[PDB]
């Protein structure tokens, strides 16, 4: 088959923040196809992986990955809070992220 993607793609909007102060420890992730928090409930707890390429080959591969989890819904437009072992660099706002279907409960 032409398509092999087994994950739902999304875009990282920005960190949880107030008008002035921001909280880098929490990130807001937009999931394609989600419109309301009720639909976003399915994605809660799903693993979140960010993939970026680095010129220097590390451990035999040039691809580096950061892992995270879906924590809770955000807003009334399907936005969902996300957390990672290491917070995103803040330079990836609007960048695509991979939301896997595991751990699945269906």
């Amino acid at each position: 088959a032409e398509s092999h993607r087994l994950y739902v793609k999304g875009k990282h909007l920005s960190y949880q923040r107030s008008k002035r102060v921001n909280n880098p420890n929490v990130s807001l992730i937009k999931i394609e196809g989600v419109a309301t928090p009720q639909d976003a409930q399915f994605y809660l707890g799903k693993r979140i992986a960010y993939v970026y390429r680095a010129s220097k080959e590390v451990r035999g591969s040039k691809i580096r990955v950061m892992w995270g989890k879906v924590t809770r819904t955000h807003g009334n437009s399907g936005v969902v809070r996300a957390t990672f072992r290491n917070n995103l660099p803040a330079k990836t706002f609007g960048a695509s992220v991979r939301i896997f279907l595991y751990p699945s409960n269906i």
Binding site: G33, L101, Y102, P103, S104, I106
Partner: protein, 144 residues
């Protein structure tokens, strides 16, 4: 001097498998070597893993242990009552080129399972096609 640990009060009670996981259910692997391949559920192992088969003859997936949390359970159930899976256990997968005994068991299990699959039309083709998402797909809407 060393100090002993306090008497912990916990019980390793048996896993409460989700209702959607029943033997003979067609599974979909989300990660690993055979990620995206459609698989048939056979038996629940002692170590909480799931004993599964492709079957091997259909898609090349051999008898493997798979985690229940990395699997999507479909509603398509193939008869598995005639397949004996009592031989396989935790010690069967204790590693440390293919072992001869492994091949013999694979064909024996496949023989019984292949006949059941042949009943429903297109089932053999269905298991031979790797699952993958397409544009416009939404897992929360997609029924499984």
């Amino acid at each position: 001097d060393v100090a002993a640990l306090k008497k912990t009060r916990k019980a390793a009670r048996p896993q409460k498998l989700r209702a959607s996981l029943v033997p003979g259910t067609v599974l979909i692997l989300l990660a690993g070597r055979f990620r995206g391949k459609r698989v048939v559920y056979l038996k629940h192992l002692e170590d909480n893993t799931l004993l599964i088969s492709g079957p091997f003859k259909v898609n090349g997936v051999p008898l493997r242990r798979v985690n229940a949390r990395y699997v999507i359970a479909t509603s398509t159930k193939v008869s598995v009552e005639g397949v004996n899976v009592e031989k396989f256990n935790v010690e069967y997968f204790a590693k440390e080129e293919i072992k001869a005994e492994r091949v013999e068991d694979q064909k024996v299990v496949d023989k019984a399972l292949i006949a059941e699959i042949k009943k429903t039309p297109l089932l053999k083709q269905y298991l031979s096609a790797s699952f993958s998402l397409k544009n416009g797909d939404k897992p929360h809407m997609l029924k499984f």
